[PDB]
Design a protein around this ligand. Sequence first.
Ligand SMILES: *NNC(=O)c1ccc(-c2ccc(C(N)=O)cn2)nc1
Length: 9
Amino acid sequence: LAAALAQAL
Ligand SMILES: *NNC(=O)c1ccc(-c2ccc(C(N)=O)cn2)nc1
């Protein structure tokens, strides 16, 4: 989950 969101950066 973190990675899925983190992609924004
Ligand atoms: N918001 N951007 C990111 O989080 C992000 C962009 C690109 C990459 C990345 C990682 C690894 C490679 C490689 N060829 O090993 C290339 N680009 N990470 C994060």
